[PDB]
Design a protein around this ligand. Sequence first.
Ligand SMILES: *[C@@H]1O[C@H](CO[C@@H]2O[C@@H](C)[C@@H](O)[C@@H](O)[C@@H]2O)[C@@H](O[C@@H]2O[C@H](CO)[C@@H](O[C@H]3O[C@H](CO)[C@@H](O)[C@H](O[C@H]4O[C@H](CO)[C@@H](O)[C@H](O)[C@@H]4O)[C@@H]3O)[C@H](O)[C@H]2NC(C)=O)[C@H](O)[C@H]1NC(C)=O
Ligand SMILES: *[C@@H]1O[C@H](CO[C@@H]2O[C@@H](C)[C@@H](O)[C@@H](O)[C@@H]2O)[C@@H](O[C@@H]2O[C@H](CO)[C@@H](O)[C@H](O)[C@H]2NC(C)=O)[C@H](O)[C@H]1NC(C)=O
Ligand SMILES: *[C@@H]1O[C@H](CO[C@@H]2O[C@@H](C)[C@@H](O)[C@@H](O)[C@@H]2O)[C@@H](O)[C@H](O)[C@H]1NC(C)=O
Lengths: 104, 109, 272
Amino acid sequence: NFPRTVMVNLNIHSDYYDRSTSPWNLHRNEDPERYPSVIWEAKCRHLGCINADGNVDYHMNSVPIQQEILVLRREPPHSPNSFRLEKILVSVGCTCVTPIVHHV
Amino acid sequence: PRTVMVNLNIHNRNTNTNPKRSSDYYDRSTSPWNLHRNEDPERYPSVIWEAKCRHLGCINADGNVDYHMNSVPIQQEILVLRREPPHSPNSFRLEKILVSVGCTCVTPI
Amino acid sequence: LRLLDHRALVCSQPGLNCTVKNSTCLDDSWIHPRNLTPSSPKDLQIQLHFAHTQQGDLFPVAHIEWTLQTDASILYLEGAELSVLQLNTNERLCVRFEFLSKLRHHHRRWRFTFSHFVVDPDQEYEVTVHHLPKPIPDGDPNHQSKNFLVPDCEHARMKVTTPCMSSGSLWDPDITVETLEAHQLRVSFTLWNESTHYQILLTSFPHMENHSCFEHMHHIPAPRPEEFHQRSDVTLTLRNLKGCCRHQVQIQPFFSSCLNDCLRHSATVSCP
Ligand SMILES: *[C@@H]1O[C@H](CO[C@@H]2O[C@@H](C)[C@@H](O)[C@@H](O)[C@@H]2O)[C@@H](O[C@@H]2O[C@H](CO)[C@@H](O[C@H]3O[C@H](CO)[C@@H](O)[C@H](O[C@H]4O[C@H](CO)[C@@H](O)[C@H](O)[C@@H]4O)[C@@H]3O)[C@H](O)[C@H]2NC(C)=O)[C@H](O)[C@H]1NC(C)=O
Ligand SMILES: *[C@@H]1O[C@H](CO[C@@H]2O[C@@H](C)[C@@H](O)[C@@H](O)[C@@H]2O)[C@@H](O[C@@H]2O[C@H](CO)[C@@H](O)[C@H](O)[C@H]2NC(C)=O)[C@H](O)[C@H]1NC(C)=O
Ligand SMILES: *[C@@H]1O[C@H](CO[C@@H]2O[C@@H](C)[C@@H](O)[C@@H](O)[C@@H]2O)[C@@H](O)[C@H](O)[C@H]1NC(C)=O
């Protein structure tokens, strides 16, 4: 500080979630005050993974993959030109993992 | 708009970490992966860690790779701030980039 | 990621006046480059330390330590940006050392430390110290990064840490699988001090064959605070099959700290 706001050239320019052994559901996150305005959040379908038969495998763990990402938020609100940079944690998808087991 | 005003006083909205979470899954996954550092001194964020799947197939119970299944990457289109030359203004560009964030095991069609 | 305390952090030492300010990992020297940049840090080392919060809980902390290079660029060294990057999520956390005074001589080698970055078990980070101002475009690096790999809760010192304990690192279920009269199995275990549910997975196999001839999942609803540390035995009936004798029974906790991904506990019953 003093704050350094800058001039940015806006040079901007579909599956698996159903087919995975750890399938997930995508949830629409809309915000007109944000860019990207619409962003999809994954939430794992089950606690276990899925076996060949389609039933939930209780011996495996359906677990989320998250990421810290950048977004632009209109500052002041509704501004067409000015925005502020924001960090946000987001779930992108799910993976199937082998659980940690201790034997006796 | 072609050109915009961006305040780089990054507002952190990633604060609700209250209940405990996270572990390293790249080795424990049925679609295991390897980490690759993607650095660029001229862009924010400078370094991004991407995943590259280990196999075309997935690791079975016995631990051997099953090819009747597929390790596939979980890609994510991400915003990046790139700092320009200097020469050819503007000073910064805002770009969309494809990134592999992890792997999942899918049933093929 | 987090710092362990929001206490008045100090970076000052004899010969040098500095305050540790926090930073957005996007430094003002990257937005606005300067022609005269300092040289790179030297001998970056990150060690696993353990610390207590002003409250009482113990956390695994990253101990970052580096030294300065002997060149005259020291005069132009304004401070340093300390950065932790978790690799799984691409989460970044920064703190900045702001030199309020100017370092002129090298008479005695300048060494720095920072031990406030809270780190998690079985995690890999990328810790980096970036001398400030950062370089000009296409300039030589002036920073040092090292990957830090934190051990799992099995580690001697680690299991006595707050995140580990909360995921039941010190929980000992005295699992006792008992073979009973007429195709019945009684499985007893002592539950933990958390109001989260549990599961029992019984998988039967033939003697020396890794194929399930019978499988059953049993639910244990979240217990009352009075029910904590008390025993919960459940009697489950097996499949009728002379041959399907090898029983593998495992308990799955669902502690807030780990949810589905908690450490499970297996026990096996034999045959003749
Ligand atoms: C959840 O449980 C854990 C572990 O539970 C303990 O072990 C199991 C097997 C059962 O036997 C339980 O009944 C036990 O509680 C809890 O962690 C333990 O907490 C106790 C009490 O806080 C700790 O015991 C002793 O710690 C220090 C060691 O230096 C002693 O000085 C303490 O004594 C003082 O405080 C007492 C209580 O205030 C008081 O009565 C005494 O007169 C004395 O002034 C204390 O006895 C133990 O060390 C902890 N375990 C570890 C390894 O840190 C945990 O607190 C529970 N959590 C929840 C949320 O319920
Ligand atoms: C960013 O920093 C402020 C200030 O905290 C301390 O002082 C700075 C000079 C620097 O040394 C920091 O690393 C220190 O941690 C943080 O604000 C504090 O927040 C807590 C509650 O979260 C509050 O009890 C304190 O009184 C606050 N201190 C002041 C002086 O405002 C702020 O949380 C830091 N941000 C993050 C996310 O770490
Ligand atoms: C580091 O620099 C600080 C700057 O001093 C400031 O100005 C004087 C006039 C006082 O009002 C002081 O409180 C201000 O902070 C000083 O604290 C001091 O010189 C140095 N601090 C230490 C701990 O050495």
